[PDB]
Amino acid sequence: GESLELGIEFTTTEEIEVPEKLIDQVIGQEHAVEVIKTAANQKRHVLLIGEPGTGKSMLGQAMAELLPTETLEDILVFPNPEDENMPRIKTVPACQGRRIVEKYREKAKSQESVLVPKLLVDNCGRTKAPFIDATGAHAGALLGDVRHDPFLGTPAHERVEPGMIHRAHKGVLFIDEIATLSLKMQQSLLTAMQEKKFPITGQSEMSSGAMVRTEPVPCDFVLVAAGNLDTVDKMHPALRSRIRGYGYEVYMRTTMPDTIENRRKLVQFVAQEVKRDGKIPHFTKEAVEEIVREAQKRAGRKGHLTLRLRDLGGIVRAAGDIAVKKGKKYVEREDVIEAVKMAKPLEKQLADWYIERKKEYQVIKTEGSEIGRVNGLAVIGEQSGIVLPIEAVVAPAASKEEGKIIVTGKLGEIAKEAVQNVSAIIKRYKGEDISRYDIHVQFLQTYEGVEGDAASISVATAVISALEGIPIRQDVAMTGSLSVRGEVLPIGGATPAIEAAIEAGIKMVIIPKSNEKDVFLSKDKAEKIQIFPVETIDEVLEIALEESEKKRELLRRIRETLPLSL
Amino acid sequence: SLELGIEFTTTEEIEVPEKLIDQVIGQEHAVEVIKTAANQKRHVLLIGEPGTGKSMLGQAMAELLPTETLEDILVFPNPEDENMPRIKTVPACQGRRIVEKYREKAKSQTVLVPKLLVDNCGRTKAPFIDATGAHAGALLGDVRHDPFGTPAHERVEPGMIHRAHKGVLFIDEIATLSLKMQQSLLTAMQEKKFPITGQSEMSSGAMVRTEPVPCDFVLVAAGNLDTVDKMHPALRSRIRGYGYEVYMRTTMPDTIENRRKLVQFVAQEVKRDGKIPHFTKEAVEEIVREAQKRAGRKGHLTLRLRDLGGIVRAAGDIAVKKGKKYVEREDVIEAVKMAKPLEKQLADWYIERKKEYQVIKTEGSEIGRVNGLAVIGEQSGIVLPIEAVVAPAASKEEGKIIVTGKLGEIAKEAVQNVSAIIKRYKGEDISRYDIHVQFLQTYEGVEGDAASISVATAVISALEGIPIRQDVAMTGSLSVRGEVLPIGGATPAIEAAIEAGIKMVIIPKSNEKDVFLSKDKAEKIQIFPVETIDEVLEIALEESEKKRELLRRIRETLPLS
Amino acid sequence: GQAMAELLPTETLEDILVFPNPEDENMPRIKTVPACQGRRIVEKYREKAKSQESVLVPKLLVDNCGRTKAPFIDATGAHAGALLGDVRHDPFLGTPAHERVEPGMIHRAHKGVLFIDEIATLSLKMQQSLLTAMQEKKFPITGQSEMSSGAMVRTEPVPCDFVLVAAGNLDTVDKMHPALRSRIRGYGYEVYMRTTMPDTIENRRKLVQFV
Numbered sequence A: 001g002e003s004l005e006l007g008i009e010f011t012t013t014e015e016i017e018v019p020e021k022l023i024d025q026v027i028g029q030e031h032a033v034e035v036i037k038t039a040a041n042q043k044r045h046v047l048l049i050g051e052p053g054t055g056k057s058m059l060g061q062a063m064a065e066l067l068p069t070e071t072l073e074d075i076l077v078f079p080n081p082e083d084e085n086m087p088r089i090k091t092v093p094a095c096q097g098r099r100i101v102e103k104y105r106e107k108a109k110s111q112e113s114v115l116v117p118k119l120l121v122d123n124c125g126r127t128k129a130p131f132i133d134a135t136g137a138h139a140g141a142l143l144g145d146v147r148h149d150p151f152l153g154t155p156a157h158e159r160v161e162p163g164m165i166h167r168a169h170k171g172v173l174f175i176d177e178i179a180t181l182s183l184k185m186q187q188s189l190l191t192a193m194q195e196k197k198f199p200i201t202g203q204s205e206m207s208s209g210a211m212v213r214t215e216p217v218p219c220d221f222v223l224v225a226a227g228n229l230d231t232v233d234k235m236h237p238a239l240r241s242r243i244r245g246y247g248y249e250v251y252m253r254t255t256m257p258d259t260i261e262n263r264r265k266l267v268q269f270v271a272q273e274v275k276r277d278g279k280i281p282h283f284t285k286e287a288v289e290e291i292v293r294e295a296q297k298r299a300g301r302k303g304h305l306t307l308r309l310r311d312l313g314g315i316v317r318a319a320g321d322i323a324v325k326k327g328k329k330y331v332e333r334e335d336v337i338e339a340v341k342m343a344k345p346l347e348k349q350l351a352d353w354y355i356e357r358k359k360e361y362q363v364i365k366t367e368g369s370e371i372g373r374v375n376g377l378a379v380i381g382e383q384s385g386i387v388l389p390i391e392a393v394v395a396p397a398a399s400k401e402e403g404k405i406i407v408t409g410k411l412g413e414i415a416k417e418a419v420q421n422v423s424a425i426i427k428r429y430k431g432e433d434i435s436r437y438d439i440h441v442q443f444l445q446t447y448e449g450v451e452g453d454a455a456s457i458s459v460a461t462a463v464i465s466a467l468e469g470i471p472i473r474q475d476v477a478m479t480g481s482l483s484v485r486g487e488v489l490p491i492g493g494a495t496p497a498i499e500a501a502i503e504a505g506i507k508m509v510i511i512p513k514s515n516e517k518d519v520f521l522s523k524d525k526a527e528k529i530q531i532f533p534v535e536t537i538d539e540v541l542e543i544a545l546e547e548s549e550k551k552r553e554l555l556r557r558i559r560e561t562l563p564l565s566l
Numbered sequence B: 001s002l003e004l005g006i007e008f009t010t011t012e013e014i015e016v017p018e019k020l021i022d023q024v025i026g027q028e029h030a031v032e033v034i035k036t037a038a039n040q041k042r043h044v045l046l047i048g049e050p051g052t053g054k055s056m057l058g059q060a061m062a063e064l065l066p067t068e069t070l071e072d073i074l075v076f077p078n079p080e081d082e083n084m085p086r087i088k089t090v091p092a093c094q095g096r097r098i099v100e101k102y103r104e105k106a107k108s109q110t111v112l113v114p115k116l117l118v119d120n121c122g123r124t125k126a127p128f129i130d131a132t133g134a135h136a137g138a139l140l141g142d143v144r145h146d147p148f149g150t151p152a153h154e155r156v157e158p159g160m161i162h163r164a165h166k167g168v169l170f171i172d173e174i175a176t177l178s179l180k181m182q183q184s185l186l187t188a189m190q191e192k193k194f195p196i197t198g199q200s201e202m203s204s205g206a207m208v209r210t211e212p213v214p215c216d217f218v219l220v221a222a223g224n225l226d227t228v229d230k231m232h233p234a235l236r237s238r239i240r241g242y243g244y245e246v247y248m249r250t251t252m253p254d255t256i257e258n259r260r261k262l263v264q265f266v267a268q269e270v271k272r273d274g275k276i277p278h279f280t281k282e283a284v285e286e287i288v289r290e291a292q293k294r295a296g297r298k299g300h301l302t303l304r305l306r307d308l309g310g311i312v313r314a315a316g317d318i319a320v321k322k323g324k325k326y327v328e329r330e331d332v333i334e335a336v337k338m339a340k341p342l343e344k345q346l347a348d349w350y351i352e353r354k355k356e357y358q359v360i361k362t363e364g365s366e367i368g369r370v371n372g373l374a375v376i377g378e379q380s381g382i383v384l385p386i387e388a389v390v391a392p393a394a395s396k397e398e399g400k401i402i403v404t405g406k407l408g409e410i411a412k413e414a415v416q417n418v419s420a421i422i423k424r425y426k427g428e429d430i431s432r433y434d435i436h437v438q439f440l441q442t443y444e445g446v447e448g449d450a451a452s453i454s455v456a457t458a459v460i461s462a463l464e465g466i467p468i469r470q471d472v473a474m475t476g477s478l479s480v481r482g483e484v485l486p487i488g489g490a491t492p493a494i495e496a497a498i499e500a501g502i503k504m505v506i507i508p509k510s511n512e513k514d515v516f517l518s519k520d521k522a523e524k525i526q527i528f529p530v531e532t533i534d535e536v537l538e539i540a541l542e543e544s545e546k547k548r549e550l551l552r553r554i555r556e557t558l559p560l561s
Numbered sequence C: 001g002q003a004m005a006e007l008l009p010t011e012t013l014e015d016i017l018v019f020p021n022p023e024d025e026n027m028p029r030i031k032t033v034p035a036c037q038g039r040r041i042v043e044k045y046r047e048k049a050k051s052q053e054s055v056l057v058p059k060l061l062v063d064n065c066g067r068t069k070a071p072f073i074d075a076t077g078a079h080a081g082a083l084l085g086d087v088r089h090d091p092f093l094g095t096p097a098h099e100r101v102e103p104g105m106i107h108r109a110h111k112g113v114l115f116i117d118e119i120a121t122l123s124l125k126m127q128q129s130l131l132t133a134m135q136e137k138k139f140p141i142t143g144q145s146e147m148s149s150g151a152m153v154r155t156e157p158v159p160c161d162f163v164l165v166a167a168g169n170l171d172t173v174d175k176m177h178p179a180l181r182s183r184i185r186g187y188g189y190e191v192y193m194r195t196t197m198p199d200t201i202e203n204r205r206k207l208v209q210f211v
């Protein structure tokens, strides 16, 4: 059998307890959770900065549940006998608003054998402070508006519409992408935050609503603004300064340690997601384990689990949908594996489509050995791996005064400097004669370019192979950065890279020892390939170069130029 | 002919399926997502080019929805507050009756009959409402203006979101809807109910707002690669976070089953166009040959069915003009020429103008002159004469390879890869010369690495004084170890050679399956697929001991494998 | 585009009339009749109205009486209201919504040709609306400015069965609404104009005809 320790024994998630309140359902953002609790108690504004689907809105909703619920109010607007264009405002305990209006409305009907106040905000029946999401709202929606009057017309007070700031009175006002609001909206929000009251007035100068401006309307909200890294510098400086000086700024984390306790929380995660969705079956232990395996793969950091839970939640819902279509009673591993494929976001679908097309015209060799030809590995996007064949040949120098290392493949800056670090090793073991050769290296078919330094050890191997005439095993693939002292440095996407080797039929893959905990392979795939974690360039060469006296002499010669420390 | 996995004489014999989901051609991922989503009422976002079947998948999803549970929506007068008409939903067909009940009382008389907003009585399929481009009042509902007076409830009009209650609401180009309408759409999605009110503030309908009206629709939104970045953020997060996202494929595997779908496709296109005759079998085969050439991908068929449908129609129009009873292969061939993409007419125009002032030898042999082949755009080739001459180095310290022709970045690196091979076989003497290579008359530039073997041949010929056959044309990329790499547009390249009267063409072996020629053209040219640079040279260079020595020298610097 | 117009049928041309809607003033009703009939119908109602003031008069939106060939309507550079139709504002006891209805060039092109050069310079919204008109062959007239009372008026769909002849130079291709180009491409033809012809005796003879 193949399983993981989840810190709890269960058959299906139906046995897993789901915390009652939202704040306890938030996983892995301990700091953000502590800020929200303090902000809810001390009534302070918050700015949440992070990637989408990281729980910013969830936190805003959680804060709402932590606010007092026994003094909620209704907001009424009445006609002003003394100044029709300044409708009067009144707040009363929740549920009272409906009664007051109902009462006046009945009298008005009766009398026509009287003016009726309008209920702007009705909080009757609320068991918790309001959560108002004003993300992307327009000026009138956010701050309130007053309809135009074509005519003998309509009383100004009943043309008054509340803004989300008013609906958020004694609750939470959530605004993601806060920096995309106009400067004027951000200034007005700031004013509302300072006064806790904000008059409603018509937004369009061309409307008769423009001359109507009610008494200040209560808007005692706790603001929970959100956005990504660009938001910081684009938002109204005065608004950011206000939150910063009277509240908290939080940067959302994207990973959490892969500990037994944290996995146990992911068990809770699947359960709360199934419960919140209400349209999917419960998950068996194997299915939850697959969810955890996905969390490890999506972390992008060894020893950690992802906190991109909107995405992982998408996989939970898709797995359930698939189970339902198959008429199953519980979601199983097979359903999760199928959900991962079916629920890929647009970005990964494009990356995979691209790599699929490239592989159809790939020139990969996986049997025998070749001089100056090595199978490197590349990762496109987040998870799209592909074998990266690289070739090298040695020629007499075109210039009588110097030897050059000429590399092609549209390399970006990091890749180009990676080749320079490699050349230091080459020049050192080869010696003075190096100035007598031009070494041409070619990353085959990289028409969209080469980025990063993960092909460092590959270039080194191809070049050393070409210089010495020692063939390179084609059944070997490799990836790894390199230091000028010969140390193999870590790379990103070890799993996607290894999966590409496996798909291509490569039997052995070399990776930095630093990345051994970044390898996530099912029992099945693990049996198809031998993984060699390495720390130094000489170890890469002893695995990749074909055996001979020539090779052993080469290794000895190279080891002579590397530090003993290595 | 070709195997189409179905026998028939004309498309008139081909049966177009019952289920719309079955009609959809080659978007297997999308089809499975639609089936999985319909079953669970999950929203779906389809991203792809126009005419790729987005609307089709939306209609198909409506069909996969329950029908026995549809409901009618009625709006009633509200005695307490006229301006807030009341809403009642009941099982389908029950709406029509409830209306007459009250209507009878009208006779027995003050009695205000409720209005039937949405009537699904008699529907066999869940509703499919295409709200693409709708204005606010049409999408969200409206209340007619009253100069005086008519009862408010009677002036209420359902929005498409309401007509789509328990059905599918389809919106292509969703990101072009005002951010405000997108907001209302979001709310309608969140609550599954949305109050109807007057949209224009110039109207008295604006003082009316009904009770939230049910709008439990499944949203199938559509757009292109720019849509997600442009739509209302709250709407975007909702869809990206809780629905399925699908990128519409642009090609499909070339199998018997898929070709069969292309037959069905032709059949459907003739039927819905209604202005053209049916297609014989060979005509359909020609449509498939086109699907193959348009894939620009060996072993695949194109999925820009809007384009294929364009050829079908142009072929039909040609059949009609000639007074033919059926569309035949000949008609389709003329259709391809008559309805080509403006991009191809442009490339063809350009190639035609250039041929007028072109230097082209197609017989004999020449030292330092090779007939390379270039592909302009996606499906138009032209012979690319490349010349090389060897001169004394201008610098006594280094020899150089100077290439002209306005080469882009990839073409320049291709030249560097070629110089590796030249330097290796030529030895140290190479630093004693300046090799000038010229892509003749390439005033709009040279792009890509498809001229790699051509440059290698021209340079080797010039260095060795070995004439190159002019009745040979060639295209292919190259690795520093001498391996010939694949190129794009192998067919258009070969076609240029045929049009130029060149008898032999060299192409990489890996592109062998990218060659799509009719029997007529195939018999006019000899195709030589190659794997390594020495094979290119043995075909293109004139026989001589000089050439035999060159090949021996070359093969000595290439891998043995 | 003009040549194509001369090749279209000319015996079934119609007149387009807009009438007042007793049941919903903001949705004027539309009626098409054989060419020349429109003028008569209006003339008739107009005379009765005059008489009665000791009645509402329908408005003739498109009058094709006397045309010997299908209309050629050049909408190059036209604004939204000119292309798709508009409804004038009402300052006041006012003017019936139906007589404030103005036809768009798409309507005038009903059963004729709608020519639009520099098609890519039209706003995206105009191109989307044109696409809709092409698909339905009918397009309601509504006020273009939200600030106008014409904005709340939206007539029944008005016929606009035109054959579109869009034009432009090489930049047009990539700048126009992709859905519009795709529509023409899949249900019509794209043509690249040549700039030269062979210098043959036959072609010179045509230049004689040209002068």
Ligand SMILES: Nc1ncnc2c1ncn2[C@@H]1O[C@H](COP(=O)(O)OP(=O)(O)O)[C@@H](O)[C@H]1O
Binding pocket: A025, A026, A027, A028, A029, A050, A051, A052, A053, A054, A055, A056, A057, A058, A059, A176, A269, A273, A307, A308, A309, A310, A311, A313, B237, B241
């Ligand atoms: N840290 C987390 N713990 C639990 N669930 C989370 C977390 N982050 C995201 N989610 C889940 O993701 C869904 C989407 O998150 P959301 O709050 O909308 O993200 P954001 O506002 O940052 O885009 C949540 O409603 C919940 O199901």
Ligand SMILES: Nc1ncnc2c1ncn2[C@@H]1O[C@H](COP(=O)(O)OP(=O)(O)O)[C@@H](O)[C@H]1O
Binding pocket: B023, B024, B025, B026, B027, B048, B049, B050, B051, B052, B053, B054, B055, B056, B057, B172, B265, B268, B269, B303, B305, B306, B309
């Ligand atoms: N995948 C497909 N399978 C079958 N027909 C297709 C496909 N894509 C496009 N078409 C054909 O093209 C016409 C236009 O497609 P449509 O669904 O309107 O595309 P989109 O909504 O993406 O514009 C269809 O009604 C049908 O005739």
